[PDB]
Design a protein around this ligand. Structure first.
Ligand SMILES: CC(=O)N[C@H]1/C(=N/OC(=O)Nc2ccccc2)O[C@H](CO)[C@@H](O)[C@@H]1O
Ligand SMILES: CC(=O)N[C@H]1/C(=N/OC(=O)Nc2ccccc2)O[C@H](CO)[C@@H](O)[C@@H]1O
Lengths: 572, 572
């Protein structure tokens, strides 16, 4: 029961051939052929600078890999954790059940962190690295990673682990012999949004998501932790919110659990960025406070875009005491984030107009009951909420809002400013709002729903048919979605992009399939911004999918495995 | 950290209410409310005969459930295995991490198998049962299941396990106190097709699928084991087919593994039905035999519907020796099946016309090179293959073919007969071929692609966009798809239906999500043929989804859990 086939490179395709015994030519395993037949080998994402993989592989001993930290600093614990994790990463080249022969060269990995004290997330942080692999003496390998920070160094270790291949014909662990790589991301913000309010996600599943993110150098986990459906965030200062708001007492995110996730992210170069969506998308947890209106309002279609309805009442002074406490509790445990997301999607005018206490407030303050004056109330809310957010984090920090009626570029400057507010765009990539916002100097996070809404395509969750943003977005479409094209000359104002997993129809059980391997397409787009299209990345995408599965990720299947074994035969 | 809410039934909806301490009314947990608020409680599928759940629940001791076989026979081992499995099923009412208080009544389960020797699968087999639950003495419960066979009895145990609810307010395991149920399926064939050739499925994942099938009384696993992409079936008599054909040496189905799956199915009332698709959908494994044509033919679009192309050469006498051996090896391990599927989908004329050996054969036998004469060659093939199939199984047994050019009702009688061939329909449910076939007396298995193709909706696997049969089919559409409506007066000729999971874009990792909970919608449709629509089953469907998750199935998420906790508020 040994493999019967071999592969040979022909016009950029590994063709399957019988491994006939009457041959003087050494047989190549599939992965070994791919490593040199493909322009970028088995790398994902492909590097942006030097990408020299040479021509040869060396047999290495799995048990003879040693990692050496050459520069000590404040990130010692992070560097040592990342180094310990390296052997585990390398074993990902080896299929489950297979065992490599413990023979071949020893590998010395040298880690050079040029600024070993630096460990803060920031939009200006340096994620660049240099990777060099060369033979050392007669019996070993020199792999040297040089980076300006821990984050660059961690990315370098990731790339390095991808330079190992398992020869399943011979049961040999192999490593690319001669490598020169220089690399750095095009965009500093490379994210996944996880909605953990429409359905609960086990913290195990959240950590697993972070593992897969780090594997493709995604660096931002946007945790949409509350909404109208539930409040799983454990607020120590306002405990009734999660007591009344959680789907169950166990379906909660404690301080200890969040600290665990935040640290797990930090070790892997992933910023854990919390969102408290306001003033819409609130409901459960707020019962008995009298601080919301329209909670469970019927008929819901008149009052909100999805059930249950519910909005904060900005006229209540006590509200901002609750908000200060929530933000403060968030700031305590989400202590690696440099940015705070404050939501601001889909505020309903009809909902605020239905409240008499709100109507009385506006009549006293000269404002009318027309659609324009409700923006004044929204501004009033956001200004006060902003103040509490700054107080909570103990500093002015960038804030994020969704595109909405408030962020309409024509009047956005009446309410916000470009220095204090980043706008997360979820309109189509062709919507006039994008160019308008960019011309007003605003910075953007791209999550255009026609390419980056990972929830689209499934059955309806209200009524029948399919969900609102169907059809399902294939990895080909997410790969080709280019912020550089969307933004043109104003592309430096694009901080990056984010795949959105809204969870009306997703939870613990479906997370792996929803995100992977599609988020890897976003990962390369944001890391490399290739001028080439999905077709040119197809073969490497099929491989990264297999790598996710080896990690224990229940990734979506893209193509028959036959296509992966027979490049060029599956096309349209 | 105890639940803060209670539920109360109002107009068929369990409404969430604060569990306020100043009340003399006992609080109901969510599931306890649902059990009596819903017409059919938490049952799935709902019974066809008597469905009397009474009004009350009794607290029971988990560790005091005893199952007693009252009639011994040849199915002793199956009955004892099913009985042992009962405690495990009951524990599925209890959420993970929660532990019930070991107090309350003892449960005596009495199993009455009226024909304890009967263990053969057949289209005429009796799957009916009676279920009665009543208090016994002052301290225990009498649950009696009466059935004409083991299969009916096993279904009865399944239904019985669904009559347990965990009260998470009090940590009590509860059981419906007074039950009278009589039940039997509308259709004898209730299936799932699993394609394990376009991608490999671990035998663990196949067994897990069978577990979930039995939970909703599905009884047929249609194993589409070979295709052009791979040959994972271990043929002892023709070992080169799997040696050359498998995706890897480990991606194989040995005799021992298949026997394991077949037995696992038998214990759970699931017929494991093998398909050897011929004469199209062959390729890998057949190299060096000269028994195929067009394998990997290019451009593939001219020769087949999907790559790789490949068809058997019916003019080679040696072919039928290979076929006899394959069928014989299949018959040896698939030894519970009463039916054999022989495929016959999508035979390409252009492919057969490209072969000179085939052309010479037809010219010698007076036949032309037109589209009509290729049906003569197909008939020639199928007649000889049929003979080998009968020889392999050692009896004339029903054979299945897909709808195709061959099975066109206008000429089907020239090639097949209604007694020997069951037709699996994968046309739309409105296609004229269905009425035509039924009027000619043919028996059908319904797998209409517009409602029962579970692979539809995802990205393209060749080129870009979405796959061929998109959009994604929601459970609402599979539920409402009625064979009774499709077939009208000829509905007794409908043997049932089958959800098809083709695997161009599915494997081990995605199996749970692809099948569940959608196949449960098919399960109720085929078991009960309700005159009511999906809306009336919505609440119970949300519950069965949760039950699959408790089983360890990574089932698709249908709706926010909030909707499940707040019936009636999520609608369109
Ligand atoms: C910013 C955002 O995406 N907001 C909501 C959101 N808003 O989009 C819509 O307004 N969708 C919609 C459009 C027409 C009809 C009904 C819903 O979509 C997500 C699901 O895709 C929800 O989870 C979000 O809460
Ligand atoms: C009986 C059957 O469904 N045959 C093939 C099959 N045939 O359907 C088509 O012909 N689809 C199609 C229609 C137009 C263009 C391209 C493919 O669909 C399945 C995938 O849904 C394949 O896995 C099957 O092998």
């Amino acid at each position: 029961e040994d493999v019967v086939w071999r592969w040979s490179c022909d016009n950029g395709k590994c063709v399957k051939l019988k491994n006939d015994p009457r041959s003087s030519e050494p047989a190549l395993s599939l992965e070994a052929c791919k490593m040199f037949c493909n322009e970028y080998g088995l790398l994902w994402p492909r590097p942006t600078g030097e990408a020299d993989l040479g021509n040869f592989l060396s047999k290495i001993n799995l048990n003879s890999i040693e990692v050496k930290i050459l520069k000590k600093g404040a990130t010692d614990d992070l560097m040592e954790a990342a180094a310990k994790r390296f052997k585990e990463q390398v074993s990902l080249a080896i299929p489950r059940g297979s065992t490599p022969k413990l023979t071949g060269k020893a590998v010395d990995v040298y880690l050079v962190n040029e600024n070993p004290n630096e460990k803060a997330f920031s939009l200006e942080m340096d994620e660049s690295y240099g990777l060099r692999v060369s033979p050392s003496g007669a019996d070993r390998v020199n792999a040297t990673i040089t980076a300006n920070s821990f984050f660059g160094m961690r990315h370098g270790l990731e790339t390095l682990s991808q330079l190992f291949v398992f020869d399943d014909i011979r049961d040999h662990l192999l490593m690319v012999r001669d490598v020169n790589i220089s690399d750095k991301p095009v965009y500093p913000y490379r994210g996944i949004l996880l909605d953990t309010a429409r359905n609960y996600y086990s913290i195990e599943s959240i950590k697993r998501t972070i593992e897969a993110m780090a594997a493709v150098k995604l660096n931002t986990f946007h945790w949409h932790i509350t909404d109208s459906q539930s409040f799983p965030f454990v607020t120590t200062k306002r405990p009734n919110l999660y007591k009344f708001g959680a789907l169950s007492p166990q379906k909660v995110y404690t301080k200890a659990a969040i600290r665990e996730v935040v640290r797990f992210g930090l070790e892997r170069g992933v910023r854990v960025l919390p969102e408290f969506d306001a003033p819409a998308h609130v409901g459960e947890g707020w019962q008995d406070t009298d601080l919301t209106v329209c909670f469970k309002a019927e008929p819901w279609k008149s009052y909100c875009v999805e059930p249950p309805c519910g909005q904060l009442n900005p006229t209540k002074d006590e509200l901002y005491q609750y908000l200060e406490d929530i933000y403060s509790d968030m700031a305590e445990v989400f202590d690696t984030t440099d940015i705070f997301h404050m939501g601001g999607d889909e505020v309903s005018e009809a909902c605020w107009n239905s409240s008499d206490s709100i109507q009385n407030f506006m009549m006293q303050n000269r404002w009318d009951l027309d659609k324009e004056s409700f923006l004044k109330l929204w501004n009033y809310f956001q200004q006060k909420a902003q103040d509490k957010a700054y107080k909570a984090f103990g500093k002015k920090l960038p804030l994020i809002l969704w595109t909405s009626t408030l962020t309409n570029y024509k009047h956005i400057d009446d309410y916000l400013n470009k220095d204090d507010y980043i706008i997360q765009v979820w309109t189509t990539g062709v919507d006039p709002q994008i160019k308008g916002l960019l011309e007003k100097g605003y910075r953007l996070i791209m999550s255009n729903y026609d390419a980056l809404y990972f929830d689209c395509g499934y059955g309806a969750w209200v009524g029948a048919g399919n969900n609102w943003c169907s059809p399902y977005i294939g990895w080909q479409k997410v790969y080709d979605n280019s912020p550089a094209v969307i933004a043109l000359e104003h592309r430096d104002q694009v901080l990056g992009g984010e795949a959105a997993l809204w969870s009306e129809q997703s939870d613990t059980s479906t997370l792996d399939g929803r995100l992977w391997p599609r988020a890897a397409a976003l990962a390369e787009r944001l890391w490399a911004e290739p001028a080439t299209s999905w077709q040119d990345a197809e073969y490497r995408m099929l491989h990264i999918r297999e790598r996710l599965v080896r990690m224990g990720i229940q990734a979506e299947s893209l193509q028959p495995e036959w296509c992966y074994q027979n490049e060029g035969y599956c096309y349209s």
